[PDB]
């Protein structure tokens, strides 16, 4: 479980509760994109989780990663599981 370390890191390095997080499930994707754009503009962080279930969503995610114009101190944190048929393009443009 990485979530507690991320929470403690967000409490340490930042203050005022800038940390925002959304899990991926039935009916959360279209607000996930809105929160992605809004926290890209604000410069605050964003933690998506469980990107191994929504496998036919990730082309929209990589399109929006290619398109957006972020600010400084923005940090996008992902969390996925080992899964065949994954998409290479965001695997290219990420640490692992």
């Amino acid at each position: 479980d990485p979530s507690q370390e991320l929470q403690e890191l967000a409490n340490a390095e930042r203050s005022g509760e800038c940390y925002h997080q959304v899990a991926m499930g039935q009916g959360q994707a279209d607000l996930a994109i809105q929160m992605l754009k809004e926290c890209a503009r604000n410069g605050d962080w964003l933690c998506l989780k469980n990107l191994h279930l929504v496998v036919s969503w990730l082309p929209v995610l990589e399109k929006e990663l290619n398109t957006l114009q972020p600010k400084d101190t923005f940090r996008l944190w992902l969390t996925a599981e080992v899964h065949p048929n994954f998409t290479p393009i965001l695997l290219q443009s990420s640490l692992k």
Binding site: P59, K63, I89
Partner: protein, 96 residues
Amino acid sequence: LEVINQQDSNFITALELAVRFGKTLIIQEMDGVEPVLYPLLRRDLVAQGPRYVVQIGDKIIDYNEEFRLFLSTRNPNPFIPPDAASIVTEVNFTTT
């Protein structure tokens, strides 16, 4: 010249203008072979006196003789079937 993105809001309208005015067209973020672009990639030219028209969806559109179409791709796989690859010649920029 006009250059357009794949997941773009004004795709078919700008495609109609590029077929009519005789532009040279470049498409950015192609994820494969679109369903729309099959008779235009083939030769489907019904004559109206001296000119020729070509089918794009529902409209009937004049095929200008200055029509040149290029399109880019960001991932070697996706996407060709074995039907839209015997008409489209494929070029792979690669680091060697």
